[PDB]
Amino acid sequence: ASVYAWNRKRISNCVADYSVLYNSASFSTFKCYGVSPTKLNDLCFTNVYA
Amino acid sequence: DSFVIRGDEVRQIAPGQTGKIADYNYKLPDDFTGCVIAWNSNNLDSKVG
Amino acid sequence: STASALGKLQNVVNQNAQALNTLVKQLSSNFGAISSVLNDILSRLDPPE
């Protein structure tokens, strides 16, 4: 969708691997602020938003 | 230390940085001191074929 | 019969207890960081910050 109508999805009750997202080079900008990208595999969250 | 890199991956050359070649091919210490220089060589280091 | 005749010793004890209590309570302040517990900071992000 357009930027003024940004599409929001809620993700929960899953097992997520972020290494398959980090290693892939298809992304020009992969910028993470509050956490280190390599530590995502060791943290458990709830109510993820995309 | 000299080598040849893709144009886009140039920002992987920094201390405290991780990447494909930054973890499997070349590593920079976090407390590195010195300078980094890079310049395009498309007219020379590239082949039409 | 009458109590509250030994106020000075009680004052000393109470002052010491209050000092220790405020010292132990001061351990729950951020001071401008992201968390007040060190283990979470260690386990959530890499050294450079």
Swiss-Prot record, chain A:
Complex formation: Binds to host ACE2. RBD also interacts with the N-linked glycan on 'Asn-90' of ACE2. Cleavage of S generates a polybasic C-terminal sequence on S1 that binds to host Neuropilin-1 (NRP1) and Neuropilin-2 (NRP2) receptors. Interacts with host integrin alpha-5/beta-1 (ITGA5:ITGB1) and with ACE2 in complex with integrin alpha-5/beta-1 (ITGA5:ITGB1). May interact via cytoplasmic c-terminus with M protein. May interact (via N-terminus) with host bilirubin and biliverdin, thereby preventing antibody binding to the SARS-CoV-2 spike NTD via an allosteric mechanism.
UniProt superkingdom: Viruses
Name under which the protein is recorded: Spike protein S1
Result for mutant: residue 26 to P: In strain: Omicron/BA.1, Omicron/BA.2, Omicron/BA.2.12.1, Omicron/BA.2.75, Omicron/BA.4, Omicron/BA.5, Omicron/BQ.1.1, Omicron/XBB.1.5, Omicron/EG.5.1
Chain's gene name: S
First-to-last residue of the parent protein present: 348 to 397 of 1273
Function: Attaches the virion to the cell membrane by interacting with host receptor, initiating the infection. The major receptor is host ACE2. When S2/S2' has been cleaved, binding to the receptor triggers direct fusion at the cell membrane. When S2/S2' has not been cleaved, binding to the receptor results in internalization of the virus by endocytosis using host TFRC and GRM2 and leading to fusion of the virion membrane with the host endosomal membrane. Alternatively, may use NRP1/NRP2 and integrin as entry receptors.
Organism: Severe acute respiratory syndrome coronavirus 2
